[PDB]
Structures are given as C-alpha cells and as structure tokens.
Amino acid sequence: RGSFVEMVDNLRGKSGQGYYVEMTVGSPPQTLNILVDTGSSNFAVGAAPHPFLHRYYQRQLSSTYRDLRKGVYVPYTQGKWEGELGTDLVSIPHGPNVTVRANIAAITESDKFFINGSNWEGILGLAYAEIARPDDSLEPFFDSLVKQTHVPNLFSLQLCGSVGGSMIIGGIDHSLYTGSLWYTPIRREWYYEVIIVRVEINGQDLKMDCKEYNYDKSIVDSGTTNLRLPKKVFEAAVASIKAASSTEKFPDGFWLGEQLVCWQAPWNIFPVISLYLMGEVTNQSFRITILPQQYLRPVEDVDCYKFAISQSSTGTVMGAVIMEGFYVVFDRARKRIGFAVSACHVHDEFRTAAVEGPFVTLDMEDCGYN
Ligand SMILES: C[C@@]1(c2cc(NC(=O)c3ccc(C#N)cn3)ccc2F)C[C@H](C(F)(F)F)OC(N)=N1
Ligand code: NA
Ligand code: NA
C-alpha cells in the first residue's frame, strides 16, 4: 500500500499511438505489448501474422490454453476485429506477482485496428462486463484478477505525454502526483462514466444546461487521444477558445482537426479549460484544469501541432489529452475515480494543470442524461 516501485514506469508508447504495458500469456509465457484501454472491456490480442505486428499470440505453443469454441465479431466506426474466444494464464511482469486464468480473444482478422509502425499487438480493456463483447458474461481481465488473487479492486494511471507512464495495479503510488486526490462517482459500471457539472474557458462559463455536457454520457478513456465534446458543447467551446486567442488567426479547418498549424522553435494566448466534476458529497464539486499543452498535440512524421479537441456523438470522452495532466485512480471498490496533479505533466513557467475543491454546485443530478 502506497509504494509500488516495481510498477513505476511500466508503460511505453509513441506519441499518437497510445500506452501499452508488457504482458505474458500462455505456458511457457509469450511476451506481448498490450494497449491499456479504460474505454473497452475485452482482452483481445493479435493471434495471426498480420504484417504490422511485431509479435502475436500462438495458442499452439501454450499448454494452458483452453478453447471456448465461440467466435466474436467486433465492429467500431473505423475498425473491426474478429476472433476466437478462449482462456489462458496471464501475468503482468512489471505488475503484481500473480498469474490468472483470463478470457483472451485471439484476433484472427482485423481492419484498421492495428497501427502500422506501432509496438503493440493487442488491447487490455479495463472497463466493465456490461460492454464486453459478445455479451456481459465474458468476464473482463480485471474482474478475473480481483476474483482469483488478493489484489485490491483498483488501479491507477499516470500517462506522461517516446511517451511513458505507470499503471499501478492494486493501489496508488504517492510519488506519482502532488496535492490531493479528488473523487468523482462512477455513475454506472459500464464505461467509466462520470458527470461533468460545469465547463469554463479561461474562467468563463459556457453557461449551458449541464445535461449538455454529458449527452449522452461522459467517460474517462485512455484508449482515445482527444478530449471529445458533444457537438453542441464543442461548438460553444471552440467559439470561446477562438475569442480567447484571436490575437493570432488560424485557418478554420484547424478547429475541425482538418489541418495542422505551425510556429518555429506561443502558449500564453491559449486559455485553460476547467471541467468541474460531480464530487462525493451532496452539492459539492471539484475542478480539473488543463493547459493548451494538453490540447495542442505536437505532430512529428510531418513545430506543428494539431487541435485535439473534437466533436462527438457518443458523449464527452476524456481521452489521453485530459489524462496526461493527471494521476487518475480507477477506484472500482468504491465506484469512484480520483484525479490529482500528475508529477510528470507537460507544463511551463506560467501556469500548471490543477485539481481544486471544494465548490458548491447545486442540482448536479440534473446534469446526467437518461
Ligand atoms: C476498442 C477501442 C480501441 C482503442 C484504440 N486505441 C488506440 O489506437 C489509441 C491510439 C492513441 C491513443 C493515445 N493517446 C490511445 N489509443 C485502438 C483500437 C480500438 F479498437 C475503440 C473504442 C472506440 F470508441 F474508438 F470504438 O475506443 C476505445 N477506447 N477503445
Ligand atoms: Na480477490
Ligand atoms: Na504525493
């Protein structure tokens, strides 16, 4: 409890390609790099020699593999994968000293799923059974870990924007953040769904019915890059950031993530974004504040950055954009998610990402969409 030195720095990544942890499956152990995705609930690994993959799961080499005789077909807006369901033994070498029998979906066909040039070969869906595919009886990796071992029912993520970071499984490591953690309730255990109760651009309120911030849900999702906002909130949000910084002009396509923008070797013009989240106590909220350093993402394989806030029709998505400013504690045993200022967040001399409270916010339960 409090000190997990072996788990510190166990995530790697390339900017734009996500964060992965090293995992082993089968006996003898097969080492795979696996994408950490708090917005899905399947443990799904390449199992066939797709050209983009460094390595894949070879079930034939595993004496402990058990076939479930059941296929799965998983489409996404862009992307699909199909595979064969089975169970095998799984450990995390830079995670707790335990081995579990987990469901694995061996991906045998995929389209637009794997990234050419990336160093991961599968995805670790850390959310709940309710969105597992094919259905909610396929118990996710984390539920099996907690059922079969003494690991507490929580994990925390420090995503440092070559990227790196830490996934602490079973606890919190205090060296990873400063100040205090503040907690928002998980509204329903499917996605890691939370409730946003107010949004401020450079300390001015968007002044929207708060139901708009969570239409139709808000989630914390390490497997998406952007801060994604409901169309109507997105519209209000760029309008406000345009006005805050209109000392310089940008092509309009920039704000739609349709073209990049460039200086040489200009942060003080861009405002901070505050999201207030529902607190633990009636009428109490807290707020997280992100810097332009989080929402203007550097692009290499071209000083050119992309606007990393985008419109959505699936609700607000607090992606890696947001998470990279914070230590984020997925406190599943108490159905709550904690934020604190990350000890590794990208910043400067003028302002810093922040987590502040308490605030008085009334009618917070109205902000949820039904
Ligand atoms: C199951 C899914 C998924 C994520 C990724 N993620 C990445 O490729 C990636 C890339 C960059 C970064 C960063 N930073 C993070 N993740 C790739 C494939 C995929 F199917 C798709 C699902 C969706 F809603 F999209 F369907 O969103 C989430 N949460 N996970
Ligand atoms: Na247990
Ligand atoms: Na600390």
Side-chain angles (χ1 to χ4, degrees), residues 1-300 302-370:
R1 280 180 68 45
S3 185
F4 302 77
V5 81
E6 62 293 327
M7 285 183 258
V8 168
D9 201 27
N10 64 354
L11 303 181
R12 285 303 178 259
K14 286 196 269 293
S15 119
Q17 295 177 352
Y19 295 82
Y20 61 81
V21 63
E22 179 182 294
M23 293 186 86
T24 72
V25 308
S27 325
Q30 291 170 45
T31 299
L32 300 167
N33 287 334
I34 297 297
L35 178 89
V36 164
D37 184 11
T38 63
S40 69
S41 300
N42 287 78
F43 182 31
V45 317
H50 188 289
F52 291 173
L53 298 183
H54 290 76
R55 69 216 126 239
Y56 49 92
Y57 182 35
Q58 296 180 98
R59 293 174 276 177
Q60 73 274 7
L61 300 182
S62 167
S63 63
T64 46
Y65 172 77
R66 293 165 191 177
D67 185 353
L68 281 160
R69 315 204 143 71
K70 191 152 148 69
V72 64
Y73 178 98
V74 184
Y76 290 118
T77 330
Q78 220 81 9
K80 58 169 243 311
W81 57 265
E82 338 175 32
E84 310 164 335
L85 290 187
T87 71
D88 209 332
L89 298 188
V90 182
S91 328
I92 304 165
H94 308 287
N97 267 41
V98 299
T99 297
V100 305
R101 183 159 290 272
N103 294 312
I104 310 181
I107 297 171
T108 56
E109 193 162 42
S110 65
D111 212 54
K112 303 193 174 196
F113 170 80
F114 294 114
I115 296 167
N116 194 17
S118 83
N119 200 40
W120 56 263
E121 293 101 51
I123 291 199
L124 182 58
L126 293 165
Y128 299 95
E130 168 85 346
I131 59 177
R133 314 278 138 73
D135 66 58
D136 73 8
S137 66
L138 193 75
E139 155 184 295
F141 177 73
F142 211 88
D143 306 30
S144 308
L145 174 69
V146 175
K147 281 208 75 167
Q148 295 168 34
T149 80
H150 293 300
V151 173
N153 190 19
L154 89 161
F155 65 88
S156 51
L157 286 177
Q158 196 202 27
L159 307 191
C160 307
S162 252
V163 297
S166 300
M167 175 167 53
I168 305 305
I169 288 131
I172 292 168
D173 181 324
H174 307 307
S175 80
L176 299 180
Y177 68 89
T178 55
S180 178
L181 284 154
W182 286 84
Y183 294 94
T184 196
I186 282 164
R187 204 211 182 180
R188 169 185 161 197
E189 290 160 317
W190 61 325
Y191 295 97
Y192 284 104
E193 183 183 359
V194 303
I195 284 159
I196 293 174
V197 305
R198 166 171 196 201
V199 180
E200 267 171 9
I201 306 298
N202 227 27
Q204 280 208 302
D205 198 2
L206 295 187
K207 280 153 182 214
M208 307 205 72
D209 162 22
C210 61
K211 226 156 187 95
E212 303 285 359
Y213 302 139
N214 304 295
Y215 168 54
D216 59 308
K217 71 187 175 275
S218 315
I219 67 169
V220 180
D221 176 8
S222 73
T224 303
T225 290
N226 282 7
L227 168 52
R228 301 180 67 221
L229 301 161
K231 185 174 182 81
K232 180 101 46 102
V233 174
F234 174 78
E235 267 157 30
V238 345
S240 179
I241 318 174
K242 285 201 214 218
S245 72
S246 80
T247 206
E248 271 212 356
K249 224 167 167 199
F250 304 67
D252 276 301
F254 168 64
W255 310 104
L256 299 171
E258 276 175 16
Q259 46 198 253
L260 296 179
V261 72
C262 309
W263 307 263
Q264 175 183 68
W267 298 106
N268 78 354
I269 69 168
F270 296 92
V272 309
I273 325 257
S274 299
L275 307 169
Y276 292 65
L277 301 176
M278 181 183 286
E280 288 190 280
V281 164
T282 282
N283 281 345
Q284 167 264 312
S285 61
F286 67 93
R287 70 157 185 243
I288 67 184
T289 283
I290 77 169
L291 311 178
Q293 289 85 332
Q294 267 83 86
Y295 65 81
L296 301 181
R297 293 267 301 200
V299 190
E300 112 94 314
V302 163
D303 267 19
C304 303
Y305 325 61
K306 199 201 175 162
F307 198 54
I309 300 178
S310 53
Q311 48 199 340
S312 158
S313 71
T314 61
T316 293
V317 182
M318 307 181 48
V321 153
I322 296 285
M323 304 180 60
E324 287 168 355
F326 307 100
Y327 190 45
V328 185
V329 173
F330 295 75
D331 180 351
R332 293 158 58 97
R334 298 162 201 85
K335 279 196 89 177
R336 70 184 182 167
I337 297 188
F339 292 82
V341 182
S342 183
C344 71
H345 89 286
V346 193
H347 80 102
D348 62 12
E349 23 180 322
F350 307 78
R351 313 154 292 181
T352 57
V355 189
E356 278 147 352
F359 299 90
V360 170
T361 307
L362 311 187
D363 301 338
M364 282 184 307
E365 302 283 354
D366 298 347
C367 301
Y369 185 77
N370 290 312

